[PDB]
Design a binder for this molecule. Structure first.
Ligand code: NCD
Ligand code: NCD
Ligand code: ORO
Ligand code: ZN
Ligand code: ZN
Ligand code: ZN
Ligand code: ZN
Lengths: 339, 343
């Protein structure tokens, strides 16, 4: 009958999409999180304050009346991005951070050098850099993209922008776990519920499960073990970032399924389970509600919430204007529930 | 427009399913291959001489008039299979071989094997009558990483097993690792292997980079590029103990593109051309024919086919889908433009 009482948490890594999808999904976040870092990978992407402003507005429009939710917008870094585009939006309180997506197909970053200036301005103004740490060379084995990024990009980057504050988003490997753990107070990381709860076997044994398919790719259990250890340790430089990344059912279940788990509805309780399992409930609240604000130099939420150890169930699916949305843990039974 | 004329090939590893599915898929094999090793993994499995005979009939019924095709049946090994049942079928020319699927401890006795030791009696009768054993070499323990299952089978099951049955002839089906490749390559005249076109053409990257592609999802799972490379080298080397085994394993589109996609590539229609494309790229065309129509027969102690077939090096596009009664089937390389095609 256990109930866990924690300070309201925040989601330091979220995809809210736009339009109809946005209207449908926000409430799952808003009804629980005080704030959330909203990713800029829209299409087209959010690379200007002006865009960031409008998007922020569309977001508020969809927030239910009762919820005190605040979206923290981010800037989509591009090779050409005007560093003054950044300051501004940053100065006006538009941008809380800037996200580095390695170039894949689309507008991500070609190279660090191409954006050196931008990065310097961020270092200066004290704007944190959010990094999707993966190399993209076609001949690089997908399971190796993260580790590779460390040596070829992360470190070098850090070594050159000494006061740069960096969040290594959704880490998935022992490599990354250790690097962060031994990093400086200017380096932090986010971890999704999926990467703590499963490993590649869960996605490929007995059938291919597109709902577990996301980036960076689920790794070997060895890696999952490192992650769980990291969180359970109390390390104060790791915090909640769901990476909730919703895709309609048929875009997931197709000949070429999209990457991303829609975990907003079940994340918190999933995280609770992990911590419990790890015998680390004492570090739970910080992960969810203290570490992030601290890294970001933001105050903690002044309100609370309760989790009840009541085996609650998960919807098979969620209605969309068109098609459905399959939630993470769909049809399954969760141990912890938000009361 | 280069021509590649070869003796009529054979498919040493095939899934023809049953019922309606069987009717749609047979023709893709029978049109091309002289004979094929037909897998026994039906629901329920083919574990009796009697089920084998009836299944073989259904296959024949579905072969189009012109096609000279002979299905070579197999028995699904199970803890409860009566060795004399296995011997009878073999003696009567019903069972050409027997297939060993990974043991699960949770497996019902009439659907599988709990362990190899449990089926010693069967194996011994195979060694004794000289019946070849076809093995799907993976250890299925939950604690084992999916990508490590094949290699772990080598050390834990394969070696030992071969050690206890020295005269048994064994085919390491659809090898997907350099581990397997090296093992087989350094083995005796009593050890052979089959390689699918997908394992030569792709690696796990193709299945996971840029989206998850269930049509490339099959068992054993696509491995890292080094493995793909190892396989390519093996076929290209001229090694005569590796032969064509498509592992064509069709599933309805809806069963592939679902929340839990079934494993298996429907490659019957395009396998041959794909193999040729591989041998070409490896500059091993001189070993193409052997791989397709001589190695297998020699291993199984069967005659090499008397007719020929021809591949033309003319560009072709693969259909997007093939109609089934209640859904569609997506072929291997669907919608693509293929380099070598049958004439
Ligand atoms: N390009 C893809 O769609 N997938 C793979 C291809 C490969 O590695 O061979 C990749 O590396 O990106
Ligand atoms: N991670 C994913 O699997 N998908 C995310 C993108 C991202 O988080 O990089 C998405 O936007 O769909
Ligand atoms: O029958 C099948 O579907 C076939 C079995 C198997 O072992 N491999 C595969 O990918 N599918
Ligand atoms: Zn990312
Ligand atoms: Zn993300
Ligand atoms: Zn198999
Ligand atoms: Zn098979």
């Amino acid at each position: 009958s256990q109930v866990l009482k924690i300070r309201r948490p925040d989601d330091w890594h979220l995809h809210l999409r736009d339009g109809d999808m946005l209207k449908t999904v926000v409430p799952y976040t808003s009804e629980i999180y005080g704030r959330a870092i909203v990713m800029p990978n829209l299409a087209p992407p959010v690379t200007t304050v002006e865009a960031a402003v409008a998007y922020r507005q569309r977001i508020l429009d969809a927030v239910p009346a009762p919820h005190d939710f605040t979206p923290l917008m981010t800037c989509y870094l591009t090779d050409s991005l005007d560093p003054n585009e950044l300051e501004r939006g940053f100065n006006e309180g538009v941008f809380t951070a800037a996200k580095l997506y390695p170039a894949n197909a689309s507008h991500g970053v070609t190279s660090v050098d191409a954006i050196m200036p931008v990065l310097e301005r961020m270092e200066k103004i004290g704007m944190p850099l959010l990094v999707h740490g993966e190399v993209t060379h076609a001949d690089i084995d997908i399971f190796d993209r993260e580790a590779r990024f460390i040596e070829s990009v992360m470190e070098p980057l850090r070594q050159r922008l000494t006061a740069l504050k960096v969040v290594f988003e959704h880490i998935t490997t022992k490599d990354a776990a250790d690097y962060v753990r031994d990093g400086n107070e200017r380096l932090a990381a986010t971890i999704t519920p999926q990467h703590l709860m499963f490993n590649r076997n869960h996605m490929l044994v007995g059938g291919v499960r597109p709902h577990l398919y996301c980036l960076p790719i689920l790794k070997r259990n060895i890696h999952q073990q490192a992650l769980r250890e990291l969180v359970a340790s109390g390390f104060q430089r790791v915090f909640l970032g769901t990476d909730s990344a919703p895709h309609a059912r048929h875009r997931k279940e197709s000949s070429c399924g999209c990457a991303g788990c829609f975990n907003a509805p079940t994340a918190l309780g999933s995280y609770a389970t992990v911590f419990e399992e790890m015998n680390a409930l004492q570090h739970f609240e910080a992960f969810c509600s203290v570490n992030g604000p601290q890294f970001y130099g933001l105050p903690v939420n002044d309100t609370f919430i309760e989790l009840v150890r009541e085996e609650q169930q998960v919807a098979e699916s969620i209605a969309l204007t068109d098609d459905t949305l399959v939630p993470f843990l769909a049809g399954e039974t969760v141990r912890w529930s938000v009361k």
